[PDB]
Design a protein around this ligand. Sequence first.
Ligand SMILES: [Mg+2]
Ligand SMILES: [Mg+2]
Ligand SMILES: [Mg+2]
Ligand SMILES: [Zn+2]
Ligand SMILES: [Zn+2]
Ligand SMILES: [Zn+2]
Lengths: 53, 34, 50, 87, 242, 114, 48, 40, 243, 180, 51, 249
Amino acid sequence: PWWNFQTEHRQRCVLMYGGARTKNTHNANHRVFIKKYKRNAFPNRTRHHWAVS
Amino acid sequence: IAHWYCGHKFRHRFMRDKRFHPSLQASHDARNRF
Amino acid sequence: YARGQHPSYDMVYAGPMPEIFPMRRDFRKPTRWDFHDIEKQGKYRTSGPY
Amino acid sequence: LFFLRMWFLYGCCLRFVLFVLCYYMSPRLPSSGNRRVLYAVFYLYNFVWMLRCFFCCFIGLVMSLFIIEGGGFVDLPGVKYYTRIVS
Amino acid sequence: LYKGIPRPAITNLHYEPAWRYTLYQAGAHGAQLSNPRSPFTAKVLGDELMQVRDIKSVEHCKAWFDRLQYLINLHYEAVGDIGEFKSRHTRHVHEFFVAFHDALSSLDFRDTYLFDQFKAVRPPELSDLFGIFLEMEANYVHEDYCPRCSLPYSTTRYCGEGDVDTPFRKHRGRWAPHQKWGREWYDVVARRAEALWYRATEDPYFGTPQHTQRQAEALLKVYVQAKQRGKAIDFMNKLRGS
Amino acid sequence: TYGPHKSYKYTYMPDPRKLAPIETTQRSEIVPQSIRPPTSYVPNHETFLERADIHRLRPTSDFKASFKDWNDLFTCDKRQLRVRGIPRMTRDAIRTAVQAFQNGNPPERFDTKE
Amino acid sequence: CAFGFQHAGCRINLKATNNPKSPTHTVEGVFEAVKALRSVSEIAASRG
Amino acid sequence: RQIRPYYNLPSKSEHGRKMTGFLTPYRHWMWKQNELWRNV
Amino acid sequence: AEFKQKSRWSSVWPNMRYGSMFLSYSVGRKLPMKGVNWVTRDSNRLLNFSNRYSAVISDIDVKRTEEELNVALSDIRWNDHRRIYWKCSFCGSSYRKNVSVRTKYHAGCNFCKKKYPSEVRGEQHGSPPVSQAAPELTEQLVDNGKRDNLATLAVTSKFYAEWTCRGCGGSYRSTIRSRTGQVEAGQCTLHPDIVAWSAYCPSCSWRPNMVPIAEEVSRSGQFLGLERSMEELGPIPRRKRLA
Amino acid sequence: ARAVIKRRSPQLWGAPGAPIIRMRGHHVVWKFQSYDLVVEHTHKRRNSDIRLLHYLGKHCPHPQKSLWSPDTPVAQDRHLFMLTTVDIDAFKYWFGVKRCRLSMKPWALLAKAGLLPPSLTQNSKIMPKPLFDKESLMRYYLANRKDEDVMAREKYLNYENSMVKTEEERAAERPVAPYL
Amino acid sequence: KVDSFHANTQYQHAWPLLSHDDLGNSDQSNNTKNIMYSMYMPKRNKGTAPW
Amino acid sequence: ITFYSDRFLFRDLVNRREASYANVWEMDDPYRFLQTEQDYEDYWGDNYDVYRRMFPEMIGRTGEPVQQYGQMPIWAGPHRQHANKSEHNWMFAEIGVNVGHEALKKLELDPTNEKRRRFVIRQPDGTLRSAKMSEMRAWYWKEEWADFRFWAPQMEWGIENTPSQEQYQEHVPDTTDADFRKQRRIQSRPVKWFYESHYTRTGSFAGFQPLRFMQRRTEREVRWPDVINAAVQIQKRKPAAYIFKAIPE
RNA sequence: UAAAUUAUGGUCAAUUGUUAGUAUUCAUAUUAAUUUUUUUAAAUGUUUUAUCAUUUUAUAAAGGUUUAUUUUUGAAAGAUUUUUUGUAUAAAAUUUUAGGAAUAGUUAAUAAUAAUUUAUAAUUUUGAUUAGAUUGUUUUGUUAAUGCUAUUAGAUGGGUGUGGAAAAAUAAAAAAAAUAAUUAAUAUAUAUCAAUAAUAAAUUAAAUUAAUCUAUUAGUCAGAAAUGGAUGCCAGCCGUUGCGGUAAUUUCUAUGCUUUUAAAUAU
Ligand SMILES: [Mg+2]
Ligand SMILES: [Mg+2]
Ligand SMILES: [Mg+2]
Ligand SMILES: [Zn+2]
Ligand SMILES: [Zn+2]
Ligand SMILES: [Zn+2]
């Protein structure tokens, strides 16, 4: 029941009447970039990857 | 705007988006933008 | 009416529907916020008028 | 909001750290006094990182492990991490 | 106009009605018996086959009317003790009649096919039904039972004790004390009788086009047993003027 | 952080329509059950298990004591086999052998241990 | 509600965090919005 | 699967399976009776 | 205290049938009802309403409610919530239920819930009673003192009563309508050979009912179940054909 | 046809072939269990949606009271209901035109629905499996035997075209006089 | 589509409400008119009127 | 809200100015406002006496009968005869591409269509029959029918309709009398639609939001103090150390 | 360059965070999710046969791909029989990085050619090639909403090349050449998924089969609610403005109070 609230969820096994049963993939994950190279010594020579792409 | 995308400041993300702007897309009139 | 010549009495020509007879007197019905003593209106007992 | 403050958290709100040093730091004026600062060390992806945090936890025993949480903003100029409350 | 392609010959379908062909019948693939009431199906089956297939609805209506008649016979009088500690109630037959009327009429479940079988299933004794309800209502006014729950005062003190379908006792409710007879309950019974009388002619399924002397005498019995003097007088005058 | 704004909870109101009595009919009435008498090939439930021991991972021979007699062995269901502390594979094997014998197939299976 | 409106919705500076934000601004902005409202009869008269 | 009776021909071979695929003439006859029901 | 074996699946909620009511399995459901406190007074005591609940008093179990539950007979109220042991005297059957569902509702003996041939149609059975239409079955019931009460039942009723089979003198459970083989019209028809297969207990019901098929196969050189159809085979209107 | 066979879930004649109707359902708590009649290949990958020729419909194996219907005194009509949603056109197309296969559970469900005869799996332990004798079968064949012409006609109607055109329809369809 | 925890295919064709046993609200003996209107029937969004 | 030109009335004005009548009663008849059957229904839908005779087809009088289908022969005979006999009713409804669309419910339920939706009810005795109209409609998403034209239908989410938890998130005794919270003296309960006339029952309506119970964008009314929350939650203060029970139970 | 009407039709668009001279979407709300109060294994013997063999059993996680992953009916379904009819390996578009430059057994023609033919070859600033990141074009979350923010499992070279097709080296919810089973859905050890778990948070009882089970509600300056003692810019508190200088409504503590209620805290 996606349209139901968090506290209103009595169970999660099936949709009781109808609708769309969709997986709640967690978008808010706070992915982290770890700097593994010196500022002027990124291995690539043209494009530099300094953050989550 | 997710904070991890591009730089910490939001203007980094906005500048990164501006390179995909349809009006400023690379062509004969606007070339070698970067 | 079939040839579009009958005088059209559209619903919009109707004005307000007046109250012909007075319905009744609605007396103040009792509620939890109307008590002679305020002792029975407590945060542990009363959460609203109804 | 400030997102560069929690650099050493690396996403997770709780950071499992060890204990090496504990000294005292003077908060930014005019708030005079001494506040207990914990110099702690942890290892993440076979890399050791050391950080200074606020020692909010009250001492009731001897502890070698601690939990670092983001906390709020503190008047101390430079530290941005709090110790987990004692349970 | 004429450069690029000649006009397709299939455009003639829009100008010549002679080419509109349906080489096969609408239900030539075995669906000729899809409609149960079509003259084609009726002719190909026969009257005996028709009654064979409609015996299901016939027996459904028969079961409905048999159960209604049994309930009426059981609860003809509203006062008594049929079981060990259960009493007679008009509410059971009222609920069954409401269920029947909803099956016949309510748009939630349009089971109106039962009405087709009223001609051969409806009992002549049950042809007058609201008169039976008025008679039961007249019997309901015995002074030794609670006007609300129809339970004796001597054996029970709370309304709805010993009744399975009591509406006066919810899951976490409180027991309701026996109500004593009075002019308020007499007028309640009078208003119920008036509503029954109106429905006796308003109902298109069980109601009759003209009222019955049985209904009139049942209503008079209700009035005399509920002690409605001016109401009974006015009823008699309107009966004379009917 | 503080929590849900309002914890949505609902009362329990009994439904007379849902609590109305329901017609039922025992499946044994439609198809009566029976227990096959022991035959010459299988005089007892003990030798029944001995014959129904074929898999190395299904030692049905060791559970002679659990079953009291032929009636118990042919009456106990899968749930009873579970509550009698019998592993899943061997209890399923016992149930399948019993059902095959009831259908008319004696446990004439060659031992595959060797 | 004091003005008597029953079917209306008012929003100031989108999200509340957006500046400026003060009680005087909150009162004067909504009062200006209500003052700058044209009634249906007035609009019809203006359109003729 | 294919049922293999216990009273079948024992393959007196240690380098392979312990039982053969042949069958008793009674087993062949009773198999035909069972196969007749499959055809019905 | 009470100590038992627990497994990971042991915390799975049990299934609840349609007849079953709301269950207070969770602590959130248990707390509000545990909040209330009960007491047995003069106006609350069940023994003071024996003129109305005489059936309840008769069906209650005097002895087993004192040792296994430590609740007095005079302490039980007519609207009691705790489940006590009952000995239904209509068939002498032991069960455990509370008094609130026995007085407010009618929830007594589980076996007597199937007393009538139809749960929906209680008293609508037009069939004669067993004591009249089948005198040969009253002697086959288990002698527990309620034989006459069970004999008063309808022949087509769906009571689940015990029977001492003549095959091996064993007590097996069966239904009286299944035993008699007849059913009330409008209900689901039973098996054609239900009388033959319900004559004995399941242990000894195989060979006697398989004697006739052995005789038939011996006589005819083959066994075929379609002889029942053949004896029926040995005018009817019909519709037209469109092919 | 693999060096190391997936011994847990083997099949016959390899993949992909012989579309078969099954009843797929995720193993959940029994009170939330519901299967799906569906036609798929013999071999299925990790996700069942890869090989899915057509979807037949849901089946709920839970006996439920008929709350939608009014409370009727009919005893048979007040028995528990086991609702199953099935498709007829696609089932017939896959069964006849493509000659698919069926498993025992879908076969039993369709036998209940009236589309198929009872499956071989469901049998009454009371009645044993009978035997046959050639002499008695020949005696019955001689006792009753249908005519060859009528048997050919009924076989033609059952298998080949059955919607025939009679002389009335032929006379109606024949061209009208002006173009003769 | 089929044979999964979130397999949303059997919910695309109309079906009656399931009341075999307790589905979290004791559906086996509870009049679920309000429950159907407030939880079971799909909404336009969280908290909106039933669709 | 609509704005017409100030000369919009000319089309009707010329008709009124050039209308001619034989008599004056024809000119001033009181039913000149009604032209179509919709107007007649809207006018005479109040009283049942005129309506029941003027519009006999409004009330459902003849529905789809239930028939039994010819069973398919089973060549196995009595061996598989028992298989069709179960203890539960088996309900089967056809689906497909054409079938199952709710927008075409009238065509699917119409018996005059050769492609109508098909149903089978296998009774426990083993015979199959056509489903009732209720059973046929049960295979579609439920819809609420209501018409406020003449009589107000039973409105959902009311004082009496909603139960205690949905009303105030607290349990109140469900008594038929002495209910000050519900603002009533005595509620003797007859059957809901027994005494009341059938035509007065026009259905029910539930296509709205119960604001007290559930609303869109449940946000805190004012941030500080933190005690106050959204208007959907109205609760009283919780007592401390309510009561203890000596009896084990 | 004319108005409308034989009158609401063709089925709901709607925004709620007590701030703090002004500029600029950036502290504290709500929803969704993670986090404490201990919920939550991926099973060990696949089978048959003509016997030292043969026949049936074809995509699980391993290896980091942005101009990229594309193919068969020769097995099977499959039917009086023989026989016959057809294919198909190819494409097109969308392709990430703050600070951006060269790439390569290489393009085309020819052919069952050329490690050694012929030619002014091909890729790329309209962002190439290496490098970093990430399993690709039906999945979520938030909102009134053009947005923003997510998603999964699996195609990682050949080298006697079996097979129709390499997908071919532990990993089932696949009954696999005799009806093994249909009273079946219940499932006891070692790494993992949601069957993982959301259950009238306190007053009249469970139409049952009685089967599983405890955690401190957080505060009390501004802003629901504080008085006495101790400390005296010290110890400490802190979402925020800040508080603590000897009357501290902000600390510690006694007691008392507050709460729209089931936590607290952080990312
Ligand atoms: Mg970050
Ligand atoms: Mg790469
Ligand atoms: Mg000061
Ligand atoms: Zn009373
Ligand atoms: Zn009993
Ligand atoms: Zn016996």
